[PDB]
Design an enzyme around this catalytic site. Structure first.
Site, PDB file in Angstrom:
ATOM      1  N   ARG A 129       0.920   7.157 -10.011  1.00 11.22           N
ATOM      2  CA  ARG A 129       1.256   5.816 -10.448  1.00 11.22           C
ATOM      3  C   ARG A 129       1.387   5.688 -11.949  1.00 11.22           C
ATOM      4  O   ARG A 129       0.457   6.059 -12.691  1.00 11.22           O
ATOM      5  CB  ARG A 129       0.166   4.899  -9.972  1.00 11.22           C
ATOM      6  CG  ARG A 129       0.135   5.004  -8.481  1.00 11.22           C
ATOM      7  CD  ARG A 129      -0.431   3.785  -7.885  1.00 11.22           C
ATOM      8  NE  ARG A 129       0.215   2.608  -8.443  1.00 11.22           N
ATOM      9  CZ  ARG A 129      -0.361   1.405  -8.512  1.00 11.22           C
ATOM     10  NH1 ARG A 129      -1.616   1.239  -8.048  1.00 11.22           N
ATOM     11  NH2 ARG A 129       0.322   0.366  -9.039  1.00 11.22           N
ATOM     12  N   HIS A 142      -3.866  -7.407  -4.267  1.00 12.32           N
ATOM     13  CA  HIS A 142      -5.242  -6.949  -4.177  1.00 12.32           C
ATOM     14  C   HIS A 142      -6.203  -7.836  -4.942  1.00 12.32           C
ATOM     15  O   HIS A 142      -7.408  -7.873  -4.625  1.00 12.32           O
ATOM     16  CB  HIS A 142      -5.355  -5.516  -4.637  1.00 12.32           C
ATOM     17  CG  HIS A 142      -4.549  -4.564  -3.809  1.00 12.32           C
ATOM     18  ND1 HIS A 142      -3.166  -4.584  -3.785  1.00 12.32           N
ATOM     19  CD2 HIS A 142      -4.921  -3.551  -2.987  1.00 12.32           C
ATOM     20  CE1 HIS A 142      -2.723  -3.623  -2.988  1.00 12.32           C
ATOM     21  NE2 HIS A 142      -3.765  -2.980  -2.493  1.00 12.32           N
ATOM     22  N   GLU A 153      -4.684  -3.821 -12.885  1.00 17.60           N
ATOM     23  CA  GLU A 153      -4.341  -2.423 -12.961  1.00 17.60           C
ATOM     24  C   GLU A 153      -4.163  -2.103 -14.407  1.00 17.60           C
ATOM     25  O   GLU A 153      -3.521  -2.875 -15.139  1.00 17.60           O
ATOM     26  CB  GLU A 153      -3.066  -2.152 -12.163  1.00 17.60           C
ATOM     27  CG  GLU A 153      -3.203  -2.804 -10.812  1.00 17.60           C
ATOM     28  CD  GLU A 153      -2.798  -1.909  -9.714  1.00 17.60           C
ATOM     29  OE1 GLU A 153      -1.562  -1.819  -9.490  1.00 17.60           O
ATOM     30  OE2 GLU A 153      -3.709  -1.301  -9.084  1.00 17.60           O
ATOM     31  N   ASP A 204      -2.514  -7.545 -10.306  1.00 18.45           N
ATOM     32  CA  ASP A 204      -1.934  -7.275  -8.998  1.00 18.45           C
ATOM     33  C   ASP A 204      -2.423  -8.409  -8.051  1.00 18.45           C
ATOM     34  O   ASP A 204      -3.652  -8.520  -7.718  1.00 18.45           O
ATOM     35  CB  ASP A 204      -2.367  -5.854  -8.527  1.00 18.45           C
ATOM     36  CG  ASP A 204      -2.267  -5.628  -7.001  1.00 18.45           C
ATOM     37  OD1 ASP A 204      -1.940  -6.538  -6.162  1.00 18.45           O
ATOM     38  OD2 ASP A 204      -2.553  -4.482  -6.631  1.00 18.45           O
TER      39      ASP A 204
END
EC number: 4.6.1.-
Lengths: 84, 96
Positions: free
Chosen positions: B90, B58, B62, B55
Site C-alpha cells: 500500500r 474503517h 492511514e 478512511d
C-alpha cells in the site's frame, strides 16, 4: 447534523490557509441537492473541488470571502448526530 | 432518507481533536475513491514528512511517508496509537 466543511490552500505553494464550517443544517440535505451532489456515497466520504458555479451557492453560508483566483477550495459533507 | 446517508460512513475527526501525532495541518486532498466523487481528507504532520488520510469505512487515519507515499499503518485519532502496521503493498505515491 450536516455541516459543510470548507477548506482552502495557496495555489502557489499548496500551503493550507484556512478552514471554516457552515452552521448545522440538521437533516436537510437540499444544499447538497443544489450543488448537484447526490447523497449516495458522498456524506462523510471526501472533499469536492469547489468550482466556480459552486461559489454563489456556497458563499451565503460562509464568513470567508471565497476567492477562487487566489486559492483552491474543497468542501466535504460532514454528518454527525446532534450538535457538534 | 438523509440521516441514513449520514451514517453510511464514519465522520472524519476535526483537525483540533486529532491527538498524538503532533501538530497537524490539513493538506490538499487527492486520493479518489472508486464509489463516491470525493477525495479522502488529508493532513500533514512532522513538517510535512508524514501524511494522514481519513478512511471513512474503517474509521481510522492511514499514515504515509510523504517522500514516496509508503504506507505506515493506521492510527486512532483519539490517542494517536498505531492500530494496524505498515503494509508493503500500500502507498499513495500517485496521489502526493
Amino acid at each position: 447534523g450536516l455541516k459543510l466543511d470548507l477548506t482552502w490552500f495557496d495555489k502557489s505553494t499548496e500551503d493550507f490557509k484556512g478552514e471554516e464550517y457552515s452552521k448545522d443544517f440538521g437533516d436537510d440535505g437540499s444544499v447538497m441537492e443544489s450543488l448537484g451532489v447526490p447523497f449516495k456515497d458522498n456524506v462523510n466520504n471526501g472533499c469536492f473541488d469547489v468550482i466556480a458555479e459552486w461559489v454563489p451557492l456556497l458563499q451565503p453560508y460562509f464568513n470567508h470571502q471565497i476567492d477562487i483566483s487566489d486559492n483552491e477550495y474543497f468542501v466535504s459533507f460532514d454528518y454527525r448526530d446532534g450538535d457538534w | 432518507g438523509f440521516k441514513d446517508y449520514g451514517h453510511d460512513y464514519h465522520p472524519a475527526p476535526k483537525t483540533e481533536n486529532i491527538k498524538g501525532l503532533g501538530d497537524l495541518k490539513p493538506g490538499i486532498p487527492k486520493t479518489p475513491k472508486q464509489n463516491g466523487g470525493g477525495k479522502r481528507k488529508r493532513w500533514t504532520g512532522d513538517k510535512g514528512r508524514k501524511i494522514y488520510e481519513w478512511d471513512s469505512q474503517h474509521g481510522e487515519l492511514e499514515g504515509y511517508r510523504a517522500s514516496d507515499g509508503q504506507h505506515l499503518g493506521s492510527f486512532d485519532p483519539k490517542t494517536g496509537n498505531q492500530l494496524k502496521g505498515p503494509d508493503p503493498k500500500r502507498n499513495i505515491k500517485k496521489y502526493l
